[PDB]
Amino acid sequence: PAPHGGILQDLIARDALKKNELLSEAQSSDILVWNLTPRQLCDIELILNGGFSPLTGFLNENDYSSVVTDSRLADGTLWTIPITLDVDEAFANQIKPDTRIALFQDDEIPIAILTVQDVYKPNKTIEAERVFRGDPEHPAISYLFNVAGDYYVGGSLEAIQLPQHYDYPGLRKTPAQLRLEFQSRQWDRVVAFQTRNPMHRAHRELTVRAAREANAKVLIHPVVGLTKPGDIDHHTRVRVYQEIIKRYPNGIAFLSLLPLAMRMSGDREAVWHAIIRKNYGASHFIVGRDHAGPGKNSKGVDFYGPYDAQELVESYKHELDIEVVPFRMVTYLPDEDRYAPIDQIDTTKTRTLNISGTELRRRLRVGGEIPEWFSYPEVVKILRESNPPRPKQGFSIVLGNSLTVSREQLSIALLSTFLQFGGGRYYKIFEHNNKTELLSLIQDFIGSGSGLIIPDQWEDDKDSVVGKQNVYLLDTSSSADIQLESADEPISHIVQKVVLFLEDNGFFVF
């Protein structure tokens, strides 16, 4: 179908004859420079390559308010997710309309020249409730208030180059490239599959089922820009993707990476994804259960209903200009060893089986077996390798403030005790002395599978520098992960307590 709004706004093509000139302006001594954030990098690439057509820059207050309240750009164009350049007061104060700012990547690579239209201070609570449904634990809201600048800068963009990427040079196709790919294959019907998670048997079946339903070739279009915090990394996922694409009949599927930054915005996001897939050359788009939804909040309640996205998308059906292929929960059928949409079964008579993501993380954490029917063996292998079970995981034991015993001796005892277990883990007594340079390496070691014995705590102001993953507190306090009986509990007694705790939590298996 035609790109949204009718014209693929591929600004790299458009501005090809201005590259040299633009390149020089960005590197000039007098121009104002803004280093793009990782989310702004994902967005600008989608803007510059035509993926966000009809967009040609970051939204000004007028288009943004319309998107916020109407799910449309000022001119009525259907657009549900606001794409804005968020900066701080300090930088904002340095600009006015007509100003030309140069946008860089890593303070080295010039990306584009932005021509300012306006500078405004959005009300984040309206944006938070209107676009994302207001729940503070929502990834998009949490980001909006804790990471995004308080000032947005609207303006038109002029391309210099798409953001740099060194992984998968050939796989990140632009809308124009993907289109030639389909074309060279004479693919006039293509159903796209959005995904930010690894694909399992269920996913493979619903995509093939969609291919057969729509008489279309299959496009696996995974997101490799930002997704939901805690997701399985994109490198591990590409490997899972490149592995599962081989379980499709030869010549039916095509894999392409999408550097999009999701907002995990359920129904609104699905609408957005469809627009994006149409721009990329798909004629059909899949929207399954809880599409782009972030699950449930700490209180156990749904951010979106399991089929809100399908409903919202269904309502814009006639103006989307891309065919939506909906699916109800596809589940496994033990008694028939096959997969099928829950809306075509049940009513009792047939038993169904499902393994939730929570159940999988857990199987991966304990080293438990994962059913041959659930996923493909080689996919499970790739997942176990990058998300190793507890006995292969790193961890840190932090000697609390309350300790009265010898910190030097308690550390040595823990180090020697741990070293006698063996099993390939590397241990170290780690002194951070409250230095950020050091504090920030803690999670690197844990990520490497190492066990760190930490002699004393870091001051509270520094706490934010350290991830708390697999970091455990030894102390007399009630908030200690490993609770001491007394501040001066003898060393041997403490070592046993720590050893058995680490074993109870699977770090040690004898």
Ligand X SMILES: Nc1ncnc2c1ncn2[C@@H]1O[C@H](COP(=O)(O)OS(=O)(=O)O)[C@@H](O)[C@H]1O
* 291 sits near ligand X (criterion: CB under 6 A): yes
Nearer to its own copies, 184 or 356 (CB): 184
- Establish whether 185 is a catalytic residue: no
- Annotate 216-258 with three-state secondary structure: CEEEEEEECCCCCCCCCCHHHHHHHHHHHHHHCCCCCEEECCE
Interaction pattern, residues 105-144, with Mg ion; x per rule: CB under 5 A: ----------------------------------------
Nearer to ligand X, 14 or 133 (CB): 133
Which entry of 130, 172, 179, 196 is annotated as an active-site residue?
Answer: 196
Q: Which two tokens stand for residue 396?
A: 């840190």
Candidates 3, 155, 163, 281; binder of Mg ion (CB under 5 A) is: 163
Nearer to ligand X, 194 or 470 (CB): 194
Candidates 55, 148, 287, 364; binder of ligand X (CB under 6 A) is: 287
* 124 sits near its own copies (criterion: CB under 8 A): no
Question: CB–CB of 264/139 below 8 Å?
Answer: yes
- Establish whether 197 is a catalytic residue: yes
Candidates 73, 116, 144, 162; binder of Mg ion (CB under 5 A) is: 162
Interaction pattern, residues 148-187, with ligand X; x per rule: CB under 6 A: ----------------------------------------
* 184 sits near its own copies (criterion: CB under 8 A): yes
Q: How far is the CB of 1 from Na ion (least distance, A)?
A: 3
Candidates 171, 213, 242, 305; binder of Na ion (CB under 5 A) is: 305
Question: CB–CB of 154/117 below 8 Å?
Answer: yes
Which SS3 state, helix, strand or coil, does residue 65 take?
helix
Alpha carbon distance 106, 108 (integer Å): 5
Nearer to ligand X, 87 or 232 (CB): 232
Rounded (10°) angle between helices 124-132 and 61-70: 40
Closest CA to 152 of 235, 88, 215, 248: 88
Q: How far is the CB of 173 from its own copies (least distance, A)?
A: 8
Non-local CB neighbours of 357 within 8 Å, separated by 6+ positions = 197
* 249 sits near its own copies (criterion: CB under 8 A): no
Candidates 26, 41, 178, 292; binder of ligand X (CB under 6 A) is: 292
End-to-end CA separation in angstroms for the chain: 60
Rg (CA), the chain: 26
Segment lying near Na ion (by CB under 5 A), choices 85-93, 298-306, 417-425, 449-457: 298-306
Q: Which two tokens stand for residue 151?
A: 């000032």
Please list the residues that pair with 220 across neighbouring strands: 193, 255
Question: CB–CB of 263/294 below 8 Å?
Answer: no
Cα dihedral sign, 126-132-137-143: negative
From Ca ion, Mg ion, its own copies, none, interface partner of 163 (C-beta below 5 to 8 A by class): Mg ion
Q: How far is the CB of 325 from Ca ion (least distance, A)?
A: 22
Which entry of 80, 195, 227, 470 is annotated as an active-site residue?
Answer: 195
Question: CB–CB of 24/30 below 8 Å?
Answer: no
* 251 sits near its own copies (criterion: CB under 8 A): yes
Give burial (CB, 10 Å; 0-12/13-18/19+) of 51: buried
Segment lying near its own copies (by CB under 8 A), choices 184-192, 333-341, 365-373, 393-401: 184-192
Non-local CB neighbours of 180 within 8 Å, separated by 6+ positions = none
Q: Which of residues 310-349 bind ligand X (CB under 6 A)?
A: 327, 329-330
123 is in an annotated binding site: no
Q: Which of residues 74-113 bind Na ion (CB under 5 A)?
A: 107
Alpha carbon distance 10, 386 (integer Å): 36
Q: How far is the CB of 73 from ligand X (least distance, A)?
A: 24
CA geometry: angle at 225 spanning 318 and 136, to 5°?
A: 80
| CA within 13 Å, CB half, 482 | 26
Please list the residues that pair with 323 across neighbouring strands: 284
- Establish whether 196 is a catalytic residue: yes
Kind of pairing, strands 100-105 and 32-35? parallel
Alpha carbon distance 11, 54 (integer Å): 11
425 is in an annotated binding site: no
Candidates 100, 165, 189, 365; binder of Mg ion (CB under 5 A) is: 165
Candidates 15, 269, 308, 475; binder of Na ion (CB under 5 A) is: 308
Catalytic positions: 195-197
**Residues at the interface with ligand X (CB under 6 A):** 194-197, 202-203, 206, 286-292, 327, 329-330
Q: Binding site for ATP: residue ranges?
A: 194-197, 288-291, 330
